[PDB]
Amino acid sequence: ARTKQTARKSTGGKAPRKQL
Amino acid sequence: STEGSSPAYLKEILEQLLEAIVVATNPSGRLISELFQKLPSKVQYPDYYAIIKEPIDLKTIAQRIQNGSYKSIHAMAKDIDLLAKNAKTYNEPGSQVFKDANSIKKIFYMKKAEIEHHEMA
């Protein structure tokens, strides 16, 4: 799934329903 | 390398049950497996293992399936429930994590039943 470093979207959470 | 009961029964599930739930989503529209997408290393991120009582994610389950840690998917599944258990332990309540994980174990068996019917007819 990863061929190198970088590429990471976390920030806060991830669980569904999360929308702003 | 999987063996256990039937090499496919486990390997087949490796891709079937594992995929089904990780591709699975919740009523909101997003992965129920979201919180179980990845289990650290049981050594590398002990905090996760400290907080949880029985950590194991969809990844670790498949990991164990072929690792001969199950020899039977009913065991994998039990970990799938544990996968959901780590849900209520690690994430926050009132969040999709709890209802999602519960749904995971549910999808799991739904996928387990169709799986068997797919490995017959």
Swiss-Prot record, chain B:
Q: Which residues carry this modification: Phosphoserine?
A: S6
Q: Where is this cross-link: Glycyl lysine isopeptide (Lys-Gly) (interchain with G-Cter in SUMO2)?
A: K38
The chain positions of domain Bromo read: 5-115
Record annotation: effect of changing R30C: Found in a endometrial cancer cell line
Subcellular localization, per the record? Answer: Nucleus
Q: In which tissues is it expressed?
A: Widely expressed.
Describe the effect of E54G: Found in hematopoietic and lymphoid cancer cell lines
Q: Quaternary arrangement and interactors, per the entry?
A: Component of the SWI/SNF-B (PBAF) chromatin remodeling complex, at least composed of SMARCA4/BRG1, SMARCB1/BAF47/SNF5, ACTL6A/BAF53A or ACTL6B/BAF53B, SMARCE1/BAF57, SMARCD1/BAF60A, SMARCD2/BAF60B, perhaps SMARCD3/BAF60C, SMARCC1/BAF155, SMARCC2/BAF170, PBRM1/BAF180, ARID2/BAF200 and actin. Interacts with PHF10/BAF45A. Interacts with acetylated 'Lys-14' of histone H3 (H3K14ac), and may also interact with other acetylated or methylated Lys residues on histone H3.
- What disease has this protein been linked to? Renal cell carcinoma: Renal cell carcinoma is a heterogeneous group of sporadic or hereditary carcinoma derived from cells of the proximal renal tubular epithelium. It is subclassified into clear cell renal carcinoma (non-papillary carcinoma), papillary renal cell carcinoma, chromophobe renal cell carcinoma, collecting duct carcinoma with medullary carcinoma of the kidney, and unclassified renal cell carcinoma. Clear cell renal cell carcinoma is the most common subtype.
Q: What does this protein do?
A: Involved in transcriptional activation and repression of select genes by chromatin remodeling (alteration of DNA-nucleosome topology). Required for the stability of the SWI/SNF chromatin remodeling complex SWI/SNF-B (PBAF). Acts as a negative regulator of cell proliferation.
Kindly provide the name given to this protein in its UniProt entry.
Protein polybromo-1
Q: What is the lineage of its organism?
A: Eukaryota, Metazoa, Chordata, Craniata, Vertebrata
Gene field: PBRM1
Which portion of the complete protein is shown here?
174 to 293 of 1689
